Amino acid sequence: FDPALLDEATDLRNGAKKLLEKLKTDYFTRSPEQHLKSLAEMKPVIETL
Amino acid sequence: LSITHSADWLGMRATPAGVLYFHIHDPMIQSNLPLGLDEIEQEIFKKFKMKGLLLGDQEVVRLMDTTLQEGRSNIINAGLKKDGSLRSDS
């Protein structure tokens, strides 16, 4: 094999991992219903602002 | 001053345990995960972990955090591993 290439492919795979984890923490740590509930909850404060 | 006068001031000679800072504030928790009330309270609590300097002893850390059995502490910036020794990041 090739230690450089060997250790490089793993970097790419871990890149895919980080991308996915970022996507997850961004949008999918709460249900869409929870997200919408939070959003709706903030409405009176915006109206005051 | 506290150590040098320790014997005279209150009775017996003492040994430097550590110097600790306590951050006085009302912290806001920034969580991406949904937290129950107990978990929130715990995070708020964690925000008050004291920075500073300690004396590396099982006895010293355990005295400062009697809850700590294994792992990291939420009061003092030190920890105990499974082996029991003070962990390096302390």
At residue B55, the 3 state secondary structure works out as coil
**Deposited experimental method:** X-ray
- Measured CA to CA, the distance from residue B74 to residue B18 in angstroms comes to 16
**Experimental structure resolution, Å:** 3.0
Chain B CB within 8 Å of residue A48 CB? no
Q: Are B87 and B80 in contact (CB under 8 A)?
A: yes
**b/e per residue, B70-87, with b = 16+ CB within 10 A?**
eebbbbbbbbbeeeeebe
In chain A, what residues touch B33 (CB-CB under 8 Å)? 29
Given an 8 Å threshold on Cβ–Cβ distance, is B32 in contact with A34? no
CB contact under 8 A, B32 and A25: yes
d(CA B66, CA B52): 18
DSSP states of chain A as a string?
A: --HHHHHHHHHHHHHHHHHHHHHHHHHSSS-HHHHHHHHHHTHHHHHH-
B61 class by beta-carbon count within 10 Å (0-12 exposed, 13-18 middle, 19+ buried): buried
